[PDB]
Amino acid sequence: MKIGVFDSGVGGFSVLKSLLKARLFDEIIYYGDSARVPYGTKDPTTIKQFGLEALDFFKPHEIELLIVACNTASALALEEMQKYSKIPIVGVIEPSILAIKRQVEDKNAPILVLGTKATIQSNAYDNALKQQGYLNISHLATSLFVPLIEESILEGELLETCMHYYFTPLEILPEVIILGCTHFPLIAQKIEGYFMGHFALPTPPLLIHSGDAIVEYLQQKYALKNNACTFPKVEFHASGDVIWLERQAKEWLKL
Amino acid sequence: MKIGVFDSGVGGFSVLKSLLKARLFDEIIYYGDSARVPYGTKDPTTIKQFGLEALDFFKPHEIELLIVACNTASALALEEMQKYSKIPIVGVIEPSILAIKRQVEDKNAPILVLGTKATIQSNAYDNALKQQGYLNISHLATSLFVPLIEESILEGELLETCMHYYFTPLEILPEVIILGCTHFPLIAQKIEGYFMGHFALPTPPLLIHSGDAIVEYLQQKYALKNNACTFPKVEFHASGDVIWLERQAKEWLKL
Numbered sequence: 179m180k181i182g183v184f185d186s187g188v189g190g191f192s193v194l195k196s197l198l199k200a201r202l203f204d205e206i207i208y209y210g211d212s213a214r215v216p217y218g219t220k221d222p223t224t225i226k227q228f229g230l231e232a233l234d235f236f237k238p239h240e241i242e243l244l245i246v247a248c249n250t251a252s253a254l255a256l257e258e259m260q261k262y263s264k265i266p267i268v269g270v271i272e273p274s275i276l277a278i279k280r281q282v283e284d285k286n287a288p289i290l291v292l293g294t295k296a297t298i299q300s301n302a303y304d305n306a307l308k309q310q311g312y313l314n315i316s317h318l319a320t321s322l323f324v325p326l327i328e329e330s331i332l333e334g335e336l337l338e339t340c341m342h343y344y345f346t347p348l349e350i351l352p353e354v355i356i357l358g359c360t361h362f363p364l365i366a367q368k369i370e371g372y373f374m375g376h377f378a379l380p381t382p383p384l385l386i387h388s389g390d391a392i393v394e395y396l397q398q399k400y401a402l403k404n405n406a407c408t409f410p411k412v413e414f415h416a417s418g419d420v421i422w423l424e425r426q427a428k429e430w431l432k433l
Numbered sequence: 434m435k436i437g438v439f440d441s442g443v444g445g446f447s448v449l450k451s452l453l454k455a456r457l458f459d460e461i462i463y464y465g466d467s468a469r470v471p472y473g474t475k476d477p478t479t480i481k482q483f484g485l486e487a488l489d490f491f492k493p494h495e496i497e498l499l500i501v502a503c504n505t506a507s508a509l510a511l512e513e514m515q516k517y518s519k520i521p522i523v524g525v526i527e528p529s530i531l532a533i534k535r536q537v538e539d540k541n542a543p544i545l546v547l548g549t550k551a552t553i554q555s556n557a558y559d560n561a562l563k564q565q566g567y568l569n570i571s572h573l574a575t576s577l578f579v580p581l582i583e584e585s586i587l588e589g590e591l592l593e594t595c596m597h598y599y600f601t602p603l604e605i606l607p608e609v610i611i612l613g614c615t616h617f618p619l620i621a622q623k624i625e626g627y628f629m630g631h632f633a634l635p636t637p638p639l640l641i642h643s644g645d646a647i648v649e650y651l652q653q654k655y656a657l658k659n660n661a662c663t664f665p666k667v668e669f670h671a672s673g674d675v676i677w678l679e680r681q682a683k684e685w686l687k688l
């Protein structure tokens with residue numbers, strides 16, 4: 179079918195990479211609000227309005243389903259967007275909760291949630307996780323990860339120092355880490371390397387990928403074949419220069 | 434005289450600080466496009482439109498002069514803005530050149546220009562400096578400085594490492610450093626310390642402050658006295674939550 183994917187910028191490509199891999203949809207209309215990104219360092223009122231405005235962008239595209247690839251938008255504007263919609267709107271938060279429920283049996287397992295300041299402040303993951311019984315949960319806003327990753331600073335001294343800055347105050351060694359942000363998958367191995375090295379772990383904690391989770395959810399609900407289509411057509415749209423956004427699509431979608 | 438001050442967000446408070454200290458105007462209308470900050474990591478077309486939209490916001494306020502405190506907006510949209518406006522519009526680039534002309538007699542003195550990617554990409558400083566005869570200029574886009582500063586990372590290993598990441602590749606030790614971004618004054622002492630420490634200098638390179646430079650230019654161009662109210666009328670406006678914008682002011686107006 180034909181669907182739309184919404185994100186604040188190019189981070190949502192991490193989710194698009196997953197969606198493509200699953201070969202679930204024939205046509206995908208991706209819209210990145212690159213003129214206003216990032217959303218994570220802003221307020222609830224502003225983000226909700228951005229969410230509603232994303233709706234207006236897709237209305238004429240005739241999409242059968244809208245994926246809010248942005249973790250920040252999913253945590254603050256999903257509710258409203260759905261209230262006003264003739265079609266289904268799926269965020270990347272709830273699907274990750276389901277991924278945890280089946281991947282993390284022990285309700286006492288230490289879980290660390292990483293996200294933007296807005297996503298963490300919303301308690302979106304904390305609320306959802308507790309409902310499912312989990313009692314050992316920790317939350318951490320790692321905002322500088324976003325700009326570092328957009329500068330393509332995916333390794334080296336600076337990145338290590340930034341992770342050390344954010345992770346040092348942590349009280350509990352996580353057994354599971356949720357990548358509650360579109361950009362974090364790009365430094366997944368680095369995050370794993372940090373904990374394995376700093377805490378001398380034989381194996382890294384478990385990381386939950388937002389894109390892979392929403393895929394598992396969309397394959398279940400809205401039942402879809404794992405190759406219901408050959409070459410999916412994709413449209414790229416942005417509030418900023420679309421050429422700049424498309425250029426990054428190459429880098430993010432690349433294996 | 435009633436004036437307007439435009440910036441992409443809270444960074445412009447560094448210019449507001451200079452304006453307030455000089456006591457030139459009795460009324461100042463501050464507008465920060467906080468819903469869309471930052472401008473520096475975006476494209477020319479997007480930035481130019483933001484500039485024109487800033488003019489639409491100010492038209493109703495009937496200001497007599499508009500200060501574009503944003504170095505990025507100054508570099509990319511100043512020309513377009515001045516074209517469709519009947520009131521004088523002053524950016525923070527030219528005043529800096531005029532201040533350098535006066536402080537640096539040696540046209541061969543090594544000058545280092547720091548700014549956002551968009552500001553540096555525009556070559557606005559390069560072209561303005563050469564016109565005045567300067568021949569030893571280096572340009573560096575220190576993008577990460579912006580988010581670091583907004584998270585108030587003004588000390589510690591992360592700031593040192595970020596500074597080292599950008600500065601270490603420099604082939605020449607600057608004698609003059611242009612803080613070509615609203616945010617940099619907040620780490621001015623740290624930058625001075627970096628060069629004094631790393632190059633065993635008894636005194637730091639001369640830093641050019643955008644805010645003081647435009648205030649000085651304004652003071653002379655309009656022959657203004659420093660006798661305006663000690664506590665003038667200041668209005669704060671923002672595209673994002675204005676409460677968030679205001680609460681940040683003390684971080685910049687501080688002492």
Ligand SMILES: N[C@H](CCC(=O)O)C(=O)O
Binds near residue numbers: 187217
């Ligand atoms: N896409 C956002 C990260 C970038 C932003 O702050 O807008 C998220 O998933 O949280």
Ligand SMILES: N[C@H](CCC(=O)O)C(=O)O
Binds near residue numbers: 472
């Ligand atoms: N105000 C911008 C810094 C923040 C931004 O990029 O928007 C400048 O002076 O270049």
